[model samples]
Target chain A: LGLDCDEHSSESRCCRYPLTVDFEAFGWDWIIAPKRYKANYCSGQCEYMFMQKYPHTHLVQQANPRGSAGPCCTPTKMSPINMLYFNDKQQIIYGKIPGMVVDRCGCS
Target chain B: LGLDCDEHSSESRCCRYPLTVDFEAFGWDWIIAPKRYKANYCSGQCEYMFMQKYPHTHLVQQANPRGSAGPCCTPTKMSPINMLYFNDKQQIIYGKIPGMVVDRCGCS
Candidate 1:
């Protein structure tokens, strides 16, 4: 109801949304430092009419609408987050956890 | 020297290259079946002037050629490959391994 994609236009737009994660709350006992993190997520629509974030999606949809599924709104770029935690041997460790932050979103 | 990117023109282009992986040769003893698989890779140049595969990279380079590093020729789309292997329990399992085949390449 907020934004509806019509036949001529699309209200679809891909973007990132905030997702804060707390180690203790999530029952991750191994995590030693940085109690929480900004592990954001990607969310949005990928309508055929107006998918300019990546025009390839629009082209694909126009060429083969039925044979192939339309592109999805997802993360196109992401990066790691530094994490300090306890290893299985009880040793303190600091490392980069991959794909923890969604840097950009697009239709893919 | 093969294909040089110059001030006036770019010999840059991104495409897939074949890569066959043999589990036994690589010492992956856990793999039970399918001795080898085609796991292609993306390789090429991402010169500022001739990167039309994805125009975003070209635009970014045009805007800040010095401040920002040029985009890389990499896999834009990939898919999983089926694998028959043994797990820690010494059990035979057939599963899909993610990002094993490069479906498409682009400047990014």
Candidate 2:
């Protein structure tokens, strides 16, 4: 781990964090969705409250506090109402939890 | 869709796609994970084949083709080894399938 993020903190501690989010003066250029470990949004109505809570999706600025930000966002043009449940050892048991949309905001 | 991606595409066709990935030339500064509805990586060995396949995760460059990249990545110092299943009306039986880690590459 010569790259350092706790000093080659072995156990494959590869690091790189470039979660870029900067733009505001609003009118929906885009907003909210830059919680690089929570807080530090810098405005545009604080990212239009996570882009009006998800209107169009996917966008993670740039970062590399070391590396590995996996599947940041992949919208075929916008798709993914919700789905995040983990537990094999990785830990997140459920959040943003709900699945399939096009039902328009009544399921969350 | 005065903002156009389908033009006042009513039915809430909010558009914003800033899925950026621009970096290349040996060494792992970072690579792979900017699909934006498929194709156009621009190199870095085409993104180190997806950054070796997750060592540290969370990074989605700058984008605003329209907006809404939904979680390009969220790794508070790193996390997420597997989980992506859907079926509500959202449609996505599963893709990056599997659950948990600390079990290391044996469950995917």
Candidate 3:
């Protein structure tokens, strides 16, 4: 795409492996499209795949907050989340990992 | 449904009002289901209406980080988010506030 290396890094950190961005979560999304009143500029992720939903998706609950592996894995026939990117607030989001869930994905 | 007031409080703090959960997001979701490795216990929100996604939705960008009523409130003919709930991290999520954007809603 020749978009730029910064674009890629700004999106994913696991540069070695590509993320399954189109992974479907049932085609569910949040249309909380409020009134875009800004007239200057805006920036954020417009493309993404729903990871899993709340309750339906579980995280790692280790007896020790630092536990590595002990049965916190396994929710569905999903995949491991290995991508890292900066949110609107410049925060690192793991997108979708083994210990988390969301609603849907991109391809919309 | 006398499940307990704690349950309600656990979900929302706007005791005076109700949340319009179950909004639709085009019926998409994540299927990252692993393997159901655990057999002990699990707790989370199974039903939730997505608010808005990123980029497609913009927040209030104040030069002083306190700007409101700017140009970040007219992306569509949507509604305002006025509910508050606790996330898995016990953090307060404004759900679908006017300043946010998610993917979809409930009713799925």
- TM-score of every candidate's chain A: 0.73, 0.15, 0.18
**Against the true structure, whose TM-score is highest?**
1
DockQ of each: 0.02, 0.07, 0.03
lDDT of 3 by residue, A25-74 (tens): 21323311211221222212212222222221122222212211111111
- TM-score for each of the candidates: 0.44, 0.16, 0.15
Candidate 2 residue-wise lDDT, B1-108, digit = tens: 111122222322222212222333223233233222211110111121132222111122222212222222111111222323345675544344222111111000
Clashing pairs in 1: none
Candidate closer to the true structure by TM-score (higher is better), 2 or 3: 2
Weakest 10 consecutive residues of candidate 1 chain B by summed lDDT = B1-10
Off by over 4 Å in 2: A1-13, A23-108, B1-59, B63-108
Off by over 4 Å in 1: A1-108, B1-12, B49-55, B65-67
Write down the lDDT of every candidate, Cα atoms only: 0.53, 0.22, 0.23
CAPRI quality level assigned to candidate 3 from its DockQ score: incorrect
lDDT of 2: 0.22
Worst 10 residues of 3 chain A by lDDT: A67-76
